[PDB]
């Protein structure tokens, strides 16, 4: 709401949703945050769940 | 046996003492283990394996993270452990960071 | 028998491979304790409950020292 992001198309906004990594003793909060683009449609064959893991690594670096 | 006296064995194994020398620690064991015998949280061995690899990358023992890829396979190869999840969560819970 | 001791071989193996998993996560459990820890898990038990006991018993061997 506060930044310009609210005005964009509802598809890429809705598929932008948050995720986190699973809790364990001694973790760091900066590592556990991530953003996940999630796919439910036919577009899976170009953005599949094994490519999402590569993306998580990229976003972390 | 029974699990209550088997927990007394654990209390003889961590400490270096007899069971008539200390009765306090076994009372802490029976107070925490008691009125709970069944996990009320998520059950999957696959997720806790993906939480052990994620932890070994965070400690930069990333060659040991490819060792766990073989040790979990060996654990499947014997196949005589009823819950593989409970001991993996237990061993994950006591993890130290020496870096 | 003979195969009834081969199952005893397959349990000592379980116990050793979980000790390799025990050292790479750097827990304090040794082999003898780990043989209690696998026995408890066959009946089914909360690791969330056992970890606090082990993390207290390792904090009560130098405080009862």
Swiss-Prot record, chain A:
**Subcellular localization:** Cytoplasm, Cytoskeleton, Microtubule organizing center, Centrosome
Q: Name the organs or tissues of expression.
A: Ubiquitously expressed.
| Signal peptide residue numbers | none
Q: What interactions and quaternary structure are annotated?
A: Component of the gamma-tubulin ring complex (gTuRC) consisting of TUBGCP2, TUBGCP3, TUBGCP4, TUBGCP5 and TUBGCP6 and gamma-tubulin TUBG1 or TUBG2. TUBGCP2, TUBGCP3, TUBGCP4, TUBGCP5 and TUBGCP6 assemble in a 5:5:2:1:1 stoichiometry; each is associated with a gamma-tubulin, thereby arranging 14 gamma-tubulins in a helical manner. Gamma-tubulin at the first position is blocked by TUBGCP3 at the last position, allowing 13 protafilaments to grow into a microtubule.
What does the sequence similarity comment in the record state about its family?
Answer: Belongs to the TUBGCP family.
So what does this one do? Component of the gamma-tubulin ring complex (gTuRC) which mediates microtubule nucleation. The gTuRC regulates the minus-end nucleation of alpha-beta tubulin heterodimers that grow into microtubule protafilaments, a critical step in centrosome duplication and spindle formation.
Q: This protein is called what?
A: Gamma-tubulin complex component 3
Curated annotation (Swiss-Prot), chain C:
Q: What is its main location?
A: cytoplasm
Statement: the UniProt record of this protein carries the keyword Ribonucleoprotein: no
What are the GO cellular component annotations? Answer: centrosome; cytosol; gamma-tubulin ring complex; interphase microtubule organizing center; spindle
Places the protein is found: Cytoplasm, Cytoskeleton, Microtubule organizing center, Centrosome; Cytoplasm, Cytoskeleton, Spindle
Is Ubl conjugation found in the keyword set?
no
Q: Name one GO biological process term.
A: gamma-tubulin complex localization
- Disulfide bond annotation, renumbered to this chain: none
- Keyword terms of this UniProt record: Acetylation, Cytoplasm, Cytoskeleton
Functional description taken from the UniProt entry: Required for the recruitment and the assembly of the gamma-tubulin ring complex (gTuRC) at the centrosome. The gTuRC regulates the minus-end nucleation of alpha-beta tubulin heterodimers that grow into microtubule protafilaments, a critical step in centrosome duplication and spindle formation.
The UniProt similarity line reads: Belongs to the MOZART1 family.
State whether it acts alone or in a complex, and with which partners, per the record: Associates with the gamma-tubulin ring complex (gTuRC) consisting of TUBGCP2, TUBGCP3, TUBGCP4, TUBGCP5 and TUBGCP6 and gamma-tubulin TUBG1 or TUBG2; within the complex, interacts with TUBGCP3 and TUBGCP6 to form a luminal bridge with actin that stabilizes the initial structure during complex assembly. Interacts with TUBG1.
Q: Could you identify this protein by its name?
A: Mitotic-spindle organizing protein 1
- Native organism: Homo sapiens (Human)
């Amino acid at each position: 709401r506060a930044t310009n992001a609210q005005f964009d198309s509802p598809e890429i906004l809705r598929r932008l949703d948050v995720r986190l990594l699973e809790v364990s003793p001694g973790d760091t909060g900066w590592d556990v945050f991530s953003l996940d683009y999630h796919v439910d449609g036919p577009i899976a064959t170009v953005f599949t769940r094994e490519c999402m893991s590569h993306y998580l690594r990229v976003f972390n670096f | 046996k029974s699990p209550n006296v088997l927990l007394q064995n654990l209390c003889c194994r961590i400490l270096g003492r007899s069971e008539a020398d200390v009765a306090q620690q076994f009372q802490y064991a029976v107070r925490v283990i008691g009125s709970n015998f069944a996990p009320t949280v998520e059950r999957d061995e696959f997720l806790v394996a993906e939480k052990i690899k994620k932890e070994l990358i965070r400690q930069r023992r990333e060659a040991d993270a490819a060792l766990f890829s073989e040790l979990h396979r060996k654990l499947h190869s014997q196949g005589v452990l009823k819950n593989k999840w409970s001991i993996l969560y237990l061993l994950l819970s006591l993890s130290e960071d020496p870096r | 028998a003979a195969a009834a001791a081969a199952n005893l071989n397959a349990v000592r193996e379980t116990m050793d491979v979980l000790l390799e998993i025990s050292r790479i996560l750097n827990t304090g459990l040794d082999m003898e304790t780990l043989s209690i820890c696998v026995r408890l898990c066959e009946q089914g038990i909360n690791p969330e409950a056992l970890s606090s006991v082990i993390k207290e018993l390792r904090k009560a061997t130098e405080a009862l020292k």
